[PDB]
Amino acid sequence: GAMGSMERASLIQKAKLAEQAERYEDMAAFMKGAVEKGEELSCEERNLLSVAYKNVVGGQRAAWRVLSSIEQKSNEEGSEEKGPEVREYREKVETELQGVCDTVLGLLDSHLIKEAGDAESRVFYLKMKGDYYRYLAEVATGDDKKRIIDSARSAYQEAMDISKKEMPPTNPIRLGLALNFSVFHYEIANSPEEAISLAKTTFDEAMADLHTLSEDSYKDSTLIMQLLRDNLTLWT
């Protein structure tokens, strides 16, 4: 694409600069360019990819929720007719969000996942695949909603199966995967009991493994454990 002429190392350097500058659209474009060089990504580079797109889609999702709320209020009884503008603009933001998700999913399918052999990398990418199908699910209303939901579930499940086999229960990627799959169950799959069970089991198995960790690894794992606890507190 437009990054085709730039060195891989320069793209990664600029992604880091864009992060410092809070220029996440630019950061995502740089990381897309880096992925399209065709080499596997290192651990740090995978994190840059994830941070970039999470910030971009996070903005779009927040905007979509504002607009959907306004649209829902407009369609109540006693609400004055205000024409097609709210729906149009919600649709515009929605389409842009879907585009970002399709871009990320495209990078994963061509060809990050198939080249990812180590557990850390493969679980990371499958979690991403789950997450971006989940964002598509949040705005889906048509013939394909069920299939989108199943695509998320399938990716998360493959990631879970590998993580349980190949990573310790305190591994931050394993933890973040479980956290997000638990949210999928609660928010998307209408399975709050599954969400709660998953969060609880994940928290308890991690707790039991903390004794094996260095101070720095303990900090990484307990940060994510607190998010599991926060959700359990919200849900029970």
């Binding site: 999470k54 956290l179 997000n180 998010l227 926060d230 919200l234």
Partner: peptide
Amino acid sequence: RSCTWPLP
């Protein structure tokens, strides 16, 4: 809302 990981 429910917390998910990376955090934007």
